[PDB]
């Protein structure tokens, strides 16, 4: 109902929280405009209005494909607020894909998972080479689900090299105790079915759970749960909160860019 609302609230505990959305949108727009025809915007992966992805190409032959899946608790944002985060990987020669997806309550989280699979699959036809995945928050959840062979085709999964869920939701059960479940509309079995900690079969890939040191206790817990279940690597980013933890993606030399492209 609402017992865990405060526990899962990020913005309320982040100084300047209100300023992130507008600045991301502005930063992303400027980046797209800067890239000219190396920005392939609004490529379709499906028929729906939000079944689109942006594909950012490096200057030379891409060394591979990096898919970034954005967050917003599966109920807000689209791909357009995050383009500028393609810079670090682009500088190392990776093509970078960013999908949008339909949002709850129009769809269920399980349907969103299926859409990300469709998106990764489409991007993987555009770019040859190894595939690396990163995703933030709900997006961290979504990239974690891509290692499920029942979700993503073998031909794509076989190519996944690294998966880096940044501040992921790994166990959806506690969300049943949040008002956001009025939108997700999950019962216990649905939360379990969509929880990465429950996945026993995974494509072979180096998984590194990346979480901010100054994040909500709930997010620190969600991270270590994933680390425990999968024996994944684990990085705690010094003094980072839920909104600036992703900032190093813009920096070619960041440790976050390094673990994603390793
Ligand atoms: Cl669901």
Cβ(69)–Cβ(135) below 8 Å: yes
How many independent structural domains does the chain possess? Answer: 1
- The length of the chain is 262
Helices (H) and strands (E) in the chain, counts: 9, 8
> Residues with beta carbon < 5 A to ion ligand 1?
108-110, 190
125, part of any domain:
yes
Residue indicated by tokens 């690294």: 162
Task: Residue 124: name the closest of 12, 203, 9 by CA.
Answer: 203
Breaks in the chain, named by the residue before each, with C–N above 2.5 Å? none
Cβ(246)–Cβ(69) below 8 Å: no
Tell me how far the alpha carbon of residue 113 lies from the centroid of ligand 1, in angstroms.
9
Tell me how far the alpha carbon of residue 199 lies from the centroid of ligand 1, in angstroms.
15
Tell me how far the alpha carbon of residue 251 lies from the centroid of ligand 1, in angstroms.
35
Tell me how far the alpha carbon of residue 104 lies from the centroid of ligand 1, in angstroms.
10
Residue 195 half-sphere exposure toward CB, CA atoms < 13 A: 21
Residue 134 token pair:
């990163």
Question: 3-state class of 234 per DSSP?
Answer: strand
14, part of any domain:
no
Tell me how far the alpha carbon of residue 108 lies from the centroid of ligand 1, in angstroms.
5
**CA 29, CA 54: separation in Å to the nearest integer?**
12
* CATH code of residue 147: 3.40.50.1820
Tell me how far the alpha carbon of residue 153 lies from the centroid of ligand 1, in angstroms.
20
5, part of any domain:
no
Tell me how far the alpha carbon of residue 186 lies from the centroid of ligand 1, in angstroms.
6
13, part of any domain:
no
199, part of any domain:
yes
Give the domain range for residue 43. 20-262
111, part of any domain:
yes
Resolution (A): 1.8
- DSSP-assigned letters across all residues of 110-176: HHHHHHHHHHHHHHHHHS-S-EEEEEETHHHHHHHHTT-TTTS-HHHHTTEEEEEEES-----GGGG
Cβ(44)–Cβ(111) below 8 Å: no
**CA 246, CA 177: separation in Å to the nearest integer?**
27
- DSSP-assigned letters across all residues of 21-55: HHHHHHHHHHHHHHHGGGEEEEEESSSSTT-EEEE
Q: How many CB atoms lie within 10 A of CB 193?
A: 14
Q: How was this structure determined?
A: X-ray
For 127: left if phi > 0, alpha if psi spans -120 to 50, otherwise beta; the answer is beta
Rg (CA), the chain: 17
Cβ(210)–Cβ(238) below 8 Å: no
Tell me how far the alpha carbon of residue 46 lies from the centroid of ligand 1, in angstroms.
20
Task: Residue 205: name the closest of 127, 257, 134, 115 by CA.
Answer: 134
Tell me how far the alpha carbon of residue 206 lies from the centroid of ligand 1, in angstroms.
26
């Amino acid at each position: 109902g609402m017992e865990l609302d405060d526990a899962y609230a990020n913005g309320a505990y982040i100084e300047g929280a209100a300023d992130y959305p507008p600045r991301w949108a502005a930063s992303a727009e400027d980046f797209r405009n800067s890239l000219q025809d190396r920005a392939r915007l609004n490529l379709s992966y499906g028929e729906g209005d939000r079944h689109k992805f942006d594909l950012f190409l490096p200057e030379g032959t891409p060394v591979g494909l990096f898919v970034f899946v954005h967050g917003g608790y599966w109920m807000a944002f689209d791909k357009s607020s995050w383009s500028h985060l393609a810079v670090g990987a682009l500088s190392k020669g990776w093509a970078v894909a960013m999908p949008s997806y339909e949002l709850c309550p129009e769809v269920r989280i399980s349907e969103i998972t299926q859409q990300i699979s469709q998106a990764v699959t489409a991007a993987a036809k555009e770019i040859d080479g190894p595939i690396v995945l990163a995703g933030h928050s709900a997006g961290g959840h979504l990239v974690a689900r891509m290692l499920d062979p029942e979700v993503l085709p073998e031909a794509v999964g076989a190519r996944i090299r690294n998966v880096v869920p940044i501040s992921p939701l790994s166990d959806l059960r506690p969300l049943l105790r949040t008002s956001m479940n009025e939108k997700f509309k999950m019962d216990a079995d649905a939360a379990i079915a969509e929880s990465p900690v429950e996945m026993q079969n995974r494509y072979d890939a180096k998984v590194t759970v990346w979480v901010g040191g100054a994040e909500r206790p709930a997010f620190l817990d969600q991270a270590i749960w994933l680390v425990e279940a999968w024996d994944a690597d684990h990085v705690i980013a010094f003094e980072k909160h839920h909104f600036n933890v992703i900032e190093p993606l813009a920096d070619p030399e960041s440790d976050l860019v390094a673990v994603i492209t390793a």
